[PDB]
Amino acid sequence: RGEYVVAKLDDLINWARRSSLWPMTFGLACCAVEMMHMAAPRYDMDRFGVVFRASPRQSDVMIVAGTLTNKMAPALRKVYDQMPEPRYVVSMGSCANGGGYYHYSYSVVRGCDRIVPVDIYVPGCPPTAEALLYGILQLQKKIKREKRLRIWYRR
Amino acid sequence: MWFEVLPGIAVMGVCLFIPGMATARIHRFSNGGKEKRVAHYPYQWYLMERDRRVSGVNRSYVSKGLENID
Amino acid sequence: MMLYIVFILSVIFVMGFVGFSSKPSPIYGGLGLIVSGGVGCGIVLNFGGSFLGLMVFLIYLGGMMVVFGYTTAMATEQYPEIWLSNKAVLGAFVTGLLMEFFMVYYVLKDKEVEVVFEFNGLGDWVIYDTGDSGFFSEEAMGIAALYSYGTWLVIVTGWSLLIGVVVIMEITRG
Amino acid sequence: ERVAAFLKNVWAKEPVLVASFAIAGLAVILPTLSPYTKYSLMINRATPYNYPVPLRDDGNMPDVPSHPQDPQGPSLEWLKRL
Amino acid sequence: TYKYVNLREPSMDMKSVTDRAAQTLLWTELIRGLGMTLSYLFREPATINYPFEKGPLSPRFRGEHALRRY
Amino acid sequence: MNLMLALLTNFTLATLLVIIAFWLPQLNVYSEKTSPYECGFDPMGSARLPFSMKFFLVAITFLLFDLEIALLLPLPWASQTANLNTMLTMALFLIILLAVSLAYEWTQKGLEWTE
Amino acid sequence: MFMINILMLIIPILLAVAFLTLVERKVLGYMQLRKGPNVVGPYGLLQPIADAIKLFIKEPLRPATSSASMFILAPIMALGLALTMWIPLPMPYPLINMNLGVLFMLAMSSLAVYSILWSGWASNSKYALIGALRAVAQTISYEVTLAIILLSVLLMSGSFTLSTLITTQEQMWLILPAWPLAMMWFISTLAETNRAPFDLTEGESELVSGFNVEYAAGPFALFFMAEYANIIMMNIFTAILFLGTSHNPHMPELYTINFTIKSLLLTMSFLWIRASYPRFRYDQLMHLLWKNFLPLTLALCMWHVSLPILTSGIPPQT
Ligand SMILES: CCCCCCCCCCCCCCCCCC(=O)OC[C@H](COP(=O)([O-])OCC[N+](C)(C)C)OC(=O)CCCCCCCCCCCCCCCCC
Ligand SMILES: CCCCCCCCCCCCCCCCCC(=O)OC[C@H](COP(=O)(O)OCCN)OC(=O)CCCCCCCCCCCCCCCCC
Ligand SMILES: CCCCCCCCCCCCO[C@@H]1O[C@H](CO)[C@@H](O[C@H]2O[C@H](CO)[C@@H](O)[C@H](O)[C@H]2O)[C@H](O)[C@H]1O
Ligand SMILES: CCCCCCCCCCCCO[C@@H]1O[C@H](CO)[C@@H](O[C@H]2O[C@H](CO)[C@@H](O)[C@H](O)[C@H]2O)[C@H](O)[C@H]1O
Ligand SMILES: CCCCCCCCCCCCO[C@@H]1O[C@H](CO)[C@@H](O[C@H]2O[C@H](CO)[C@@H](O)[C@H](O)[C@H]2O)[C@H](O)[C@H]1O
Ligand code: SF4
């Protein structure tokens, strides 16, 4: 049966991608400090297979951890475009989510989703390190639900 | 705990043990149960080539003893 | 086909020479010299000189590493030239390959060839020695003799290398 | 006195170079003082890489042996005891 | 009041000079640093097993909003 | 043969891994994705512009020193000579001249990088 | 039967490399008061498999400005040469028994540098170029001292054959009569393998990713597999050189176990060192080798030429 095979192959690639999520070493403001605390020993994001890598060419996730200003917006879009696919964006904190405390500023982008597509929105100012980890595990369960091969089979 | 690092080390150790064990056993299988003949110098190659002719079966590792001298 | 191993490697030897002799960007010229140095090591090794072959390869790998560094510093342009990018480079490159290909084609066809001078194409093995059975490498004995017979060679080479350091310091002290 | 004053200074500032020169000096010096150096050349001579071509016995070579196990010819008793 | 963090003169007696030569050549202070990371290898890690375990919080924690009733 | 077979197998294994890497994944190529990386902003000037080498003199000295080891690597074989008086003298002579050349370049500030 | 032997060498190499990545992350983790991968498979045992599958289904990118052929060639050279380094290794029997195995390993190590130089240059990006030129400096720093360190050791072994080192060390490890050289050799292998504190050609905190910054997915994986294969191979080389395992011809597997344990611990030491020290500055690496190791290495080379002659203990040529 073709369906059974592509169903199992979807599980394999979905498992491999969520089990090995490499965020780009990309932080913007206060929220990056809680992101640092997710890598710290108490939460040890490495133990889920989550490893920071500096190069966008070697990153699977962009965690927008902090305010995105207008001056920074073209750079964030640049490094997002330079990530190979599949790629995911996690929006962390009120600033990234929708402008937050600086929503009405002349120099702030009112939400990073004006610039890049966003898979998960982590609320808080900042979200606790555990709240960000909950957001990453939520991203994993989203990847687990993907049906690329199943949809390809029925094209 | 630190001993939870051991399982990955053991897997790494078994994988690194395989090439040495495999090479040693394939040499015995391919050389009639003995070590592969080592010929670093022309003299050693000469004798090995002479053993190939002497074997009568074109194998330098098939040995002939007293039973071959009448 | 394996009996023609030295010939095949020597064909690649020339191809590497045509590579850097057509003079593309020195980055690619260095690549062509590495290939030639690699197969050149293979040619000499097949004549019984394992130490000579590996040594020339080792030296030329170190030399081309320096050339690479100097190239990015002192011999680079905005658009470094590959063999296809330049008409003069391509013409020399093609001319070299065609001269090479025709020498190969005719030497194989006739088992001989006249390219200015006469070369026999029976295969290179025919000239080899037929009786070896010593307990040593003759190349290793000859090279090691540099320290017992080559006292004079040791002195002039050692002195030249020391003077070489003194000289390059002088030459590059503006 | 200056022998120790200079040496102490380099020991404090560049012990790596002090060790280098001391080791190099021993390499140059000890071979001429060692009583075992003479055996290095004897062992190299006693190593038979070549066949020992026999001599045509012409009737007056008392110092040469007729058989490998004859008392004449060099011996390696010194080598077994080394 | 103030203190100096780095204003000390090394002693020049032969024992101290040799102690420093051994440090420079035998890498004693680099070996010492290896000891510290080794001690950490055998310490229990501080990691909690999220989501089965949770970081501690207090009654004042400010999280998701809610409207209450009588 | 064994040697050529081993080299061919290794470099063929590497080539197959690259072939799979390029033909198996789904691709989506556009200009911004393939643009050169420089931390989010476009590069200023070509990466082919000259890159000054501050250790150029050590690099040339490496060539001379790298040939010395070609002269020294035969020493294990040279030690089997019967003429050990000459061999030991010439071996030490060569290494000392290497040390003298190093000491000269050191004292003349050849090992300091240009600033 | 030789083709089977080749596969029984390189399939295990790549599997050992994959699980060395897991071991490093766990060892670093516990040294850092955390755990490291323990979710993907029991004790993280499936984590290397997940990463490998992830990368090879990731989209590979050819940069717009890159030199296409050289961009592809470099990772192929890196892994190909890394696997070639293993063929003369006696464990206890080499796959290929070479008269000049040590010289072969030196030559192949030099050739592997060009996979760094060409990948960085072919990327046509500034961080990649800076990384590649750091590899030029690194090679200039260690290569001369590395060869002369080996020479001094081989003056006791008597040959360039790797299997002779087993015979040389049948009574005693060479680490005893040559621990100063072992010290300098061990550091040189860290520089040779681009390992911390000499991780300069990648230098993440400085160059983002250095020579491989433009590489993604499978092509990037080839560079990772190459480096980690070289780390294991260089510690096997260190074990053979200095910690010779006794070889019983009738029980060759006892040699393999003892030798494998030694090589593992030496590899663990590389990870341990990475956890402990800050990074060198790449000009300070060059001064370390030329101003400290080289003067000492030259002196010790003189000593190890003279010592066999003066003690009448020159090894056999054969
Ligand atoms: C050490 C080496 C490690 C190697 C690891 C190897 C990975 C092992 C696991 C393989 C899982 C199966 C592959 C699935 C991943 C495919 C990537 C993907 O997600 O594409 C989604 C795409 C989705 O396409 P789509 O049609 O649904 O939509 C994409 C188009 N737009 C953008 C418009 C929507 O799937 C496919 O297109 C085809 C899926 C086929 C799955 C079977 C793969 C066959 C392999 C042959 C490929 C031909 C080239 C030869 C390569 C060598 C063969 C081995
Ligand atoms: C009978 C006569 C006998 C004659 C022969 C006698 C010979 C023995 C006596 C000679 C001295 C022996 C010691 C020689 C070892 C090499 C010493 C050395 O080179 O260290 C110096 C080097 C530079 O140190 P630094 O302070 O920065 O600079 C000095 C001032 N310019 O310092 C460094 O190298 C710093 C290195 C930094 C990187 C270190 C990272 C790893 C550290 C942990 C490794 C532990 C060692 C394990 C070895 C394993 C071996 C398998
Ligand atoms: C990157 C490009 C590299 C280009 C490399 C170019 C290599 C040069 C090609 C050399 C080809 C040599 O070709 C070789 O010629 C001889 C001719 O006697 C053939 O040898 C032949 O000898 C006998 C004659 O009695 C025939 O019966 C036999 O069938 C045939 O093998 C070899 O089978 C062939 O392999
Ligand atoms: C910048 C220029 C620097 C030039 C430096 C030159 C340094 C040379 C130092 C001398 C080196 C050799 O030193 C010399 O070695 C030979 C043998 O090896 C020794 O000779 C000793 O052993 C040999 C055999 O091995 C015997 O033939 C001899 O009877 C015995 O005395 C000498 O006793 C020793 O004096
Ligand atoms: C036979 C081989 C073994 C013998 C050793 C051979 C190598 C000798 C190396 C050079 C020795 C003299 O040459 C060298 O001169 C320079 C002067 O600029 C000194 O160097 C001086 O500045 C440099 C850089 O700051 C440092 O090494 C040191 O702080 C200081 O001494 C060296 O301390 C001295 O070693
Ligand atoms: S959301 Fe809050 S914590 Fe995060 S960057 Fe903005 S102000 Fe700082």
Coordinates of C-alpha atoms in Angstrom, one line a residue, chain B residues 40-41, chain C residues 51 140, chain F residues 73-80, chain G residues 97-103 150-169 174 237 240-241 314-318:
Chain B
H40 CA 58.0 -5.0 3.0
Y41 CA 61.2 -5.9 1.0
Chain C
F51 CA 60.1 7.7 -0.4
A140 CA 66.3 4.1 1.0
Chain F
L73 CA 63.4 12.3 7.6
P74 CA 66.0 9.9 6.2
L75 CA 67.8 10.0 9.6
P76 CA 66.4 6.7 10.9
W77 CA 67.9 4.9 7.8
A78 CA 71.2 6.9 8.0
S79 CA 71.7 5.6 11.5
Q80 CA 72.2 2.1 10.1
Chain G
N97 CA 50.4 -2.4 5.0
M98 CA 52.7 0.4 3.9
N99 CA 56.5 0.6 4.3
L100 CA 56.2 4.4 4.8
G101 CA 52.8 4.5 6.5
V102 CA 53.8 7.5 8.7
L103 CA 54.8 9.5 5.6
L150 CA 57.4 12.1 14.6
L151 CA 61.0 11.8 13.4
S152 CA 62.4 11.9 16.9
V153 CA 60.1 9.1 18.0
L154 CA 60.9 7.0 14.9
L155 CA 64.6 7.2 15.7
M156 CA 63.6 4.7 18.4
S157 CA 61.3 2.6 16.2
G158 CA 63.8 2.4 13.3
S159 CA 61.2 2.6 10.5
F160 CA 58.3 4.5 9.0
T161 CA 56.1 1.5 9.3
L162 CA 53.2 1.8 11.6
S163 CA 53.2 -1.9 12.6
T164 CA 56.8 -1.6 13.8
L165 CA 55.7 0.8 16.5
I166 CA 53.9 -2.2 18.0
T167 CA 57.1 -4.2 18.1
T168 CA 59.1 -1.2 19.4
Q169 CA 56.7 -0.8 22.4
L174 CA 57.2 5.0 24.3
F237 CA 47.7 7.5 15.9
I240 CA 50.0 3.6 18.5
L241 CA 52.9 6.1 18.7
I314 CA 70.0 1.8 17.5
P315 CA 66.9 -0.1 16.4
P316 CA 66.9 -2.6 13.5
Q317 CA 66.2 -1.3 10.1
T318 CA 63.8 -4.2 9.5

